[PDB]
């Protein structure tokens, strides 16, 4: 597993080298689900490299990958060591040069996350986390905040790529509910992987979002939990990777409270 993980960190840095080299140049910006669901040649290029490169040394292992699934692969997850890959997390950021794009990699066996590597290449920040062996940014150990007063909280969330009116409605409302507790504020840097690493550093108290996929939070989640945080469903349930819903917080107290206040948005899971 340190073999598998030590390889990932090295792969992450390469992918990263590619993405932040790409970010300087002419972009080939295509569509996916909609006029707002974006992708570039770089997304695909990187995902392919990451997969061939892993598959080569571990042909036993399976892969869930954002764009692979999007060319008709399937996000059914098993007990085979799966590699869960978002090649560029923050594709709209990437397309805009808004300076937070992350390469996210997450290793699962028996349907549990062993280790995650999130590399934020513009920042020059590599976050890692092995189960039981802590979480780090660039060699430096991380710890979540100590806050339990919801009303002294800083939250991060995203508005989501969806523009379906009944969903945007629900989204902004949930935000308003939380904002009017009041909390100290809400941030959105543009990428789930990073919004969550920021929670790991204790820069922010809690991240939550409905609409995310398993590849967005496979990597960043074990970093948060290993930074001493917690993950949950927006129901107050334990976190489900395929639920498409996540609360990632410094503690159970804060997580429990955000859970109470927001409404559960209808989205179909990654396992359906």
| Residues contributing to the annotated binding site for substrate | 66, 88-91, 190-192, 209, 216
Give catalytic residues, as residue numbers. 66, 86, 88-89, 91, 216
* 163 near a second copy (CB under 8 A): yes
| Structure-token pair, residue 80 | 């085979």
CB of 26 to a second copy, least distance (A): 10
Residue span binding Cl ion (CB under 5 A) among the ranges 91-99, 112-120, 235-243, 255-263 = 91-99
Tell me the backbone φ, ψ of residue 136, rounded to 5 degrees. Answer: -140, 150
∠ CA 162-167-169, nearest 5°, is: 120
Whole-number Å distance between alpha carbons of 125 and 84 = 20
Q: Are 55 and 63 in contact (CB under 8 A)?
A: yes
Residue with Cβ nearer Cl ion (91 or 243): 91
CA–CA separation, 172 and 130 (whole Å): 35
Is 186 one of the binding residues for a second copy (CB under 8 A)?
yes
Cβ nearer to a second copy, comparing 57 with 97: 97
Task: Tally Cβ neighbours within 10 Å of residue 65.
Answer: 22
How many residues would you count in the chain?
Answer: 272
Tokens standing for residue 130? 């092995």
Determine if 216 is a binding residue for Mn ion (CB under 5 A). Answer: yes
Lookup: tokens for 200: 């790991």
Provide the 3-class DSSP secondary structure of residue 102. strand
Binding mask 44-83 for Mn ion (x = CB under 5 A): ----------------------x-----------------
Would you state the structure tokens that stand for residue 249, as one six-digit string? 């917080």
Segment contacting Cl ion by CB under 5 A, of 90-98, 102-110, 131-139, 247-255: 90-98
One residue of 40, 91, 147, 195 binding Mn ion per CB under 5 A? 91
The site string for a second copy over 212-251 (x = CB under 8 A, - otherwise) reads ----------------------------------------
Q: Which of 208, 175, 171 is nearest to 192 (CA)?
A: 208
Using CB under 8 A as the criterion, which residues of the chain lie in contact with a second copy when the complex forms? 35-36, 38, 92-93, 95-99, 145, 151, 154, 159, 161, 163, 165, 168-169, 172, 175-176, 179-180, 182-190, 198, 201-205
């Amino acid at each position: 597993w340190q073999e598998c993980m030590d390889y990932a960190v090295t792969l992450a840095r390469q992918a990263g080298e590619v993405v932040c080299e790409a970010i300087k140049n002419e972009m080939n910006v295509m569509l996916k689900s909609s006029p707002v669901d974006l992708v570039t040649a770089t997304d695909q290029k990187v995902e392919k490299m990451l997969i061939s490169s892993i598959k080569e040394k571990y042909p036993s292992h399976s892969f869930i990958g954002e764009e692979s699934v999007a060319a008709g692969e399937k996000s059914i997850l098993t007990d085979n060591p799966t590699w869960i890959i978002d090649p560029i997390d923050g594709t709209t950021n990437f397309v805009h040069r808004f300076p937070f794009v992350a390469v996210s990699i997450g290793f699962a066996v028996n349907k549990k996350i062993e280790f995650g590597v999130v590399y934020s290449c513009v920042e020059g920040k590599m976050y890692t986390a092995r189960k039981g062996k802590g979480a780090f940014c660039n060699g430096q150990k991380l710890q979540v905040s100590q806050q339990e007063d919801i009303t002294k909280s800083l939250l991060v969330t995203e508005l989501g790529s969806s523009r379906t009116p009944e969903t945007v409605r629900m989204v902004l409302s949930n935000m308003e509910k939380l904002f009017c507790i009041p909390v100290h504020g809400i941030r959105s840097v543009g990428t789930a992987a990073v919004n969550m690493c920021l929670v790991a550093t204790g820069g922010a108290d809690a991240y939550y979002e409905m609409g995310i996929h398993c590849w967005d939070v496979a990597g960043a989640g074990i970093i948060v939990t290993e930074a001493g945080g917690v993950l949950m469903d927006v129901t107050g349930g334990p976190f489900d990777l395929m639920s498409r819903r996540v609360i990632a917080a410094n503690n159970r107290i804060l997580a429990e409270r955000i859970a109470k206040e927001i409404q559960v948005i209808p989205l179909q899971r990654d396992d359906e």
